[PDB]
């Protein structure tokens with residue numbers, strides 16, 4: 001029917017316009033995210049230089065684990081939240097199969113929404129309003145407080161984020177999070193002078209905040225790139241459907257004109 | 272056809288874990304047989320021979336059919352299974368009443384003990400031997416620890 | 428004490444298993460009887476009806 | 482099924498009871514059950530008075546079972562009653578026509594039989610001038626007022642028909 | 643070119659060889675080389691025997707090189723063969739008609755020359771009653787069975803044709 | 804009318820967001836077999852059981868079979884309530900409570 | 914062609930209506946408890 005085809009044409013044209021505008025907006029936000037990712041990367045990677053020079057190795061036999069997953073509250077990205085959820089589920093499986101008591105944290109509503117139906121006994125806290133405004137160090141500080149002011153004395157942790165490689169490529173990375181007992185009991189830390197348990201506690205708290213900040217600043221850039229490419233693809237597909245439906249519409253309008261002519265001609269020929 | 276109406280959760284509370292499937296199957300067959308007794312009447316409609324006396328022009332075949340049918344002994348099946356479940360019910364009632372008398376013994380002992388605890392002398396007229404009689408877990412293991420303080424020092 | 432009294436209540440409820448079994452035996456025998464009567468009726472009427480139809 | 486009949490009955494209720502000027506209702510090619518319902522609603526609500534003849538609504542009905550000629554002229558009959566009330570008395574009149582599309586439709590149903598080449602969408606060639614000669618009489622003049630409420634059926638929700 | 647002939651040949655292979663009764667293939671307005679293929683394939687597979695009376699299929703062909711009268715009546719000829727096998731023999735018959743649409747189309751081609759006012763899409767006004775008269779004979783009665791497989795062409799892929 | 808005004812309102816509200824579990828319950832309750840026209844009393848009993856909450860404790864998949872069982876029970880030991888609904892045409896608060904407790908017991912046993 | 918996505922009643926108009934109804938029923942529950 002001509003009216004159905006016209007309805008569908010108008011609908012898909014609106015969809016194409018909206019996805020094009022969203023691609024432009026994601027490009028504008030990704031520019032700023034990739035600009036802010038340089039000093040944030042220097043900061044967050046200098047925060048980890050100690051554990052790479054002292055070669056902290058974590059415990060092999062400890063019991064409790066804390067698994068953080070970094071995502072946002074916004075969709076239309078692609079395989080961002082799904083990658084985080086797949087890694088989190090795989091790691092929870094591989095840890096619980098080793099007897100380790102695992103507790104989950106989800107930064108961003110999408111990861112909690114994905115994992116809350118199957119992994120909800122193994123859950124500690126989640127965080128909301130991640131993605132609208134760019135992440136700040138205040139966000140990492142708040143997450144680190146509510147991870148510290150929670151009473152869950154973990155033995156080891158991991159944080160699963162989307163490390164940004166390029167405009168097209170991001171890779172789901174995982175970083176370790178050590179406890180006071182892991183960095184205090186290490187034999188490679190005997191060369192660090194003027195150290196007691198209190199300074200190590202303060203240092204581990206600050207480094208938790210730092211690794212959360214670094215993960216947020218990588219994930220925001222990865223997600224803005226993914227959303228830009230996803231909206232680009234959506235606009236491409238909408239244009240394809242628009243072309244096919246325009247062909248169908250022209251066909252149908254020609255057929256309708258011919259049918260009306262034939263009706264008029266057959267009415268006139270019967271007189 | 273006098274049936275015993277049955278509660279269907281009480282039937283569930285009394286089923287051990289090695290015959291839950293059997294209880295479910297008995298329940299399903301109970302419902303199936305109720306439905307099937309509902310979907311067929313009690314007595315077949317004995318058709319009058321009228322439509323077969325005055326509308327069959329054949330030599331007595333309808334008549335000999337009706338004679339052979341009026342005097343047919345259709346086999347009524349016998350129970351052969353209710354007597355043994357009655358015997359099993361008798362045996363089970365015996366075992367259950369025995370266990371219940373045991374439980375009443377335990378209950379009278381518990382009631383004696385609760386009277387004993389309720390009639391304790393107040394704790395400020397109480398010696399330490401009286402406490403070791405009331406709550407025997409508060410007694411010093413003077414065999415495992417023969418020397419003072421008769422307990423681990425950390426316990427203090 | 429409460430637990431023991433509850434155990435006694437369940438023991439008192441025990442008899443429904445044998446009620447169920449007896450119900451099923453009686454109902455199966457009745458279903459079989461009525462199906463047999465319907466079979467004999469249907470065969471007799473069916474042959475008489477073949478005669479009347481030819 | 483969008484609410485033309487319910488809305489026109491609500492307008493009847495409100496205005497034609499807030500009015501004292503000899504309303505007129507013309508049922509053109511619509512359901513007979515609805516006509517009976519409206520008749521009994523008006524008898525019940527005192528607008529039509531079976532005894533003590535002080536009613537204030539005239540009814541004209543040509544319904545779906547009527548041939549195309551009756552459904553094409555019943556609107557003109559109701560129009561004529563309203564025209565008398567407006568001109569021959571000066572009164573201010575209400576005219577409720579449900580449904581006026583049927584008028585046009587009725588014409589189409591005889592067009593080919595009157596020897597006329599069809600127009601677009603199967604309508605008579607004279608659709609516009611017929612609608613104009615019927616509609617230009619439903620009007621307020623200096624002689625009197627005619628407030629006209631017409632229900633107009635839209636086939637297949639087109640509005641470009 | 644969606645696979646009507648492939649499907650009907652698959653059904654001939656899967657059902658007609660494993661069939662106990664007789665079979666009739668009515669080629670109606672189709673490719674003549676397809677009829678030649680079917681003939682020679684049935685000879686190879688022994689379903690048609692050129693030397694004795696053990697043949698199990700009767701073929702009736704009026705193909706797309708035929709004028710519209712032959713294309714309109716060849717389906718009726720095949721029906722007559724199958725109807726004889728169903729009634730006077732009491733057999734269970736298999737009747738394959740490829741393509742039955744041609745029947746209707748053939749009627750269309752003559753409908754103008756017979757002097758009739760065209761119906762929708764230029765078809766004869768008698769399309770439905772002609773189709774019914776033809777199709778009601780393609781049936782199972784309580785005198786014999788006919789299982790019928792009819793390939794139906796859809797013009798321009800329009801199922802609302 | 805009593806049961807169906809509420810059922811229509813809730814089905815509309817479910818179509819608006821397709822609460823949601825009650826809506827799915829009512830949808831799977833509107834399904835029906837072929838050549839099985841139910842009596843108006845049994846229809847009222849089923850829509851009551853579905854609109855009062857007695858079906859949200861069950862998963863959407865099993866709803867159908869429950870209905871069958873339910874009907875069976877109601878047409879086996881509760882011909883009095885069905886005859887009451889049939890004669891009076893409406894449900895009374897007494898018969899409301901009667902069918903309430905019947906369906907509560909059956910759901911407990913189901 | 915404003916509002917043509919919802920007007921076409923496709924898979925995108927149904928999800929638009931679902932989104933509006935979800936959001937505004939949440940907001941109505943939030944606004945009724947604070948009244």
Ligand SMILES: Nc1ncnc2c1ncn2[C@@H]1O[C@H](COP(=O)(O)OP(=O)(O)O)[C@@H](O)[C@H]1O
Nearest residue numbers: 482483484485486487488489490491515632634
């Ligand atoms: N104002 C209204 N309020 C509630 N429901 C209405 C209203 N108007 C119409 N409806 C519903 O839509 C149906 C159609 O009524 P109707 O006035 O006959 O529409 P139409 O005349 O345009 O075909 C009504 O039966 C009613 O169910």
Ligand SMILES: Nc1ncnc2c1ncn2[C@@H]1O[C@H](COP(=O)(O)OP(=O)(O)O)[C@@H](O)[C@H]1O
Nearest residue numbers: 643644645646647648649650651652740793795
């Ligand atoms: N079952 C099939 N498997 C593979 N290809 C098929 C099948 N059916 C049809 N085709 C393809 O579609 C083509 C048309 O086959 P055909 O049945 O003669 O078309 P028509 O619908 O006009 O009868 C075939 O040549 C073949 O390429």
Ligand SMILES: [Mg+2]
Nearest residue numbers: 485486511580
């Ligand atoms: Mg109307």
Ligand SMILES: [Mg+2]
Nearest residue numbers: 646647648672
């Ligand atoms: Mg072909």
